[PDB]
Ligand binder design. Structure first.
Ligand SMILES: [Br-]
Ligand SMILES: [Br-]
Ligand SMILES: [Br-]
Ligand SMILES: [Br-]
Length: 343
């Protein structure tokens, strides 16, 4: 527990965003407690993702030394030298959360995942010259925001909700009305208590023919008002979000360094999580110094932000204690440790 109170994770290969993401998920206290509850007795230690995540969280909560992740990577089968380089942070997140959600089904914590991370959107198509619209609900668990050519997060949200023209030769097939010029877009109906925003600095194949990293300046705030992107708003619960995590990458596309900044209590007291080294830092370092740019004469910037709904903040970050871990689970991990101590 060091001197920040918090312990790091081991550098065990090119796992890229993984340690950052695990720290982010660990300090989503409501998720952690829920994960502690899954009926993982009788699971195979080798094969079980639920158990493997239980183990890592337990270690992060009790261990005074940097925590290993080997059994975690084995279980969801990303073990080759470059398996994390072939995926992104939002893909690993879904891998983890889907295993966990699937374990929680039929348990006293079923629905913890959609409760904390799921939001609702309306996807619509409006024809210009014919009276036809098709409104359909879409669920999301995270949001990929465009950052290229945008000054900040507000412009990104503006761009995300911008109307798109559908015109021949890209006309909408309007059924009985045949091919029709249309407008399509999305609107938000609900925003989740925990909001995962990926910033698209790392981008596809610009036709020819690399994955590249955009290191342009992109500003995000400590406090994020999203009411004006909602179809209708609640007077008693405005869509006000507070910045909780800034996942940072330093360098370019090919090779770089991965760090995450957290204020895991939600008070504005920030720590820097750099694998095994956890140290406290200024708020400027966690935030402004991660805007990116090319400024003094800079390759260090956020690719992912986590925001927490201010009204649900002090709950999402609710106290965890030792008693929140069931005895059966404590006993099992303790026995494994004892086996390991036999070398
Ligand atoms: Br390990
Ligand atoms: Br793979
Ligand atoms: Br990205
Ligand atoms: Br720039």
């Amino acid at each position: 527990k060091k001197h920040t109170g918090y312990v790091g994770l081991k550098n065990q290969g090119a796992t890229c965003y993984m340690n950052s993401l695990l720290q982010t998920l660990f300090f989503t206290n409501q998720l952690r407690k829920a994960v502690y509850m899954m009926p993982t007795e009788g699971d195979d230690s080798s094969k079980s993702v639920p158990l493997a995540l239980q183990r890592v969280f337990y270690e992060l909560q009790h261990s005074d030394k940097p925590v290993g992740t080997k059994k975690l990577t084995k279980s969801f089968g990303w073990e080759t030298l470059d398996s994390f380089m072939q995926h992104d942070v939002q893909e690993l997140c879904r891998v983890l959360l889907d295993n966990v959600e699937n374990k929680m089904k039929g348990t006293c914590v079923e629905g913890t995942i959609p409760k904390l991370f799921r939001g609702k959107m309306v996807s619509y198509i409006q024809c210009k010259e014919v009276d036809y619209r098709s409104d359909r609900r879409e669920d999301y668990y995270d949001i990929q925001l465009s950052i290229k050519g945008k000054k900040n997060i507000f412009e990104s949200f503006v761009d995300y909700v911008a109307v798109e023209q559908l015109d021949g030769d890209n006309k909408y097939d309007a059924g009985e009305h045949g091919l029709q010029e249309a407008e399509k877009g999305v609107k938000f109906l609900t925003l989740p208590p925990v909001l995962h925003l990926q910033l698209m600095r790392f981008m596809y194949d610009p036709q020819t023919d690399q994955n590249i990293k955009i290191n342009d300046r992109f500003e995000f705030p400590e406090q994020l008002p999203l009411d004006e992107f909602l179809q209708k708003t609640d007077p008693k619960d405005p869509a006000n979000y507070i910045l909780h995590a800034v996942l940072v990458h330093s360098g370019d596309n090919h090779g770089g360094h991965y760090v995450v900044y957290l204020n895991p209590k939600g008070d504005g007291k920030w720590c820097k999580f750099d694998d095994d080294v956890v140290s406290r830092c200024t708020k400027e370092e966690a935030i402004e110094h991660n805007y990116g740019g090319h400024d003094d004469d800079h390759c260090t910037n956020a690719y992912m932000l986590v925001y927490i709904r201010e009204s649900k903040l002090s709950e999402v970050l609710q106290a965890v204690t030792d008693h929140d871990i069931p005895q059966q689970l404590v006993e099992r991990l303790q026995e494994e440790k004892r086996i390991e101590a036999q070398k």
